Assembly symmetry: C5
Homo-oligomer: 52 residues x 5
């Protein structure tokens, strides 16, 4: 191998300044974007409800 | 093989906490983003219509 | 081959419920996102113009 | 080769209806998205400044 | 090798007009998008607070 041990070791070395179960990081970025859009939705609606 | 059986098995094991036909997950993330933009569009327009 | 004929056939089979020249689908997703941002721009500006 | 000449030729053939230095296209899509978010930021702020 | 030296050299040559620690560029694009969504959130909320 060597190539894998070098890649995995490179990550663990540069990721020593993080505290997440990995899955959270990936799921967060994607799920967040989607959630954000939905959030902006309900938001604009609220503003309108106030204008009425 | 072995590499495939390991990858596919790894997914089915970590995806046991989900209930979607796969296609929905992928199509949702992409289609949603696009739909969100359109949604924010009509939204800002509505707000303006109220200000008039 | 076999691998290609299987992949291409898998798409044509699952894409039988679509009606686009392919290029439109790809260009739309990307171009749309970009266009959406621009759209939200001019939108917020319009709202402000009304508040003045 | 043959595979490369076919891929590169396929692009130049389908990209004959474009006028950009390539780098602009890529940098634009990414930089634009980022810029758009910033733009929407200052925008919402402006609206608020008017409400005050 | 040759292929690597050509790729890495091609980047350093086209990236001579930049001043970032690399990691910042990648982390910025992703983290920014996410941050932007959150930003637009608190923004719409502020506007509403003013309408009340």
């Amino acid at each position: 191998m060597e190539k894998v041990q070098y890649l995995t070791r490179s990550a663990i070395r540069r990721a020593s300044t993080i505290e997440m179960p990995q899955q959270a990081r990936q799921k967060l970025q994607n799920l967040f974007i989607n959630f954000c859009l939905i959030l902006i939705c309900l938001l604009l609606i609220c503003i309108i409800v106030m204008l009425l």
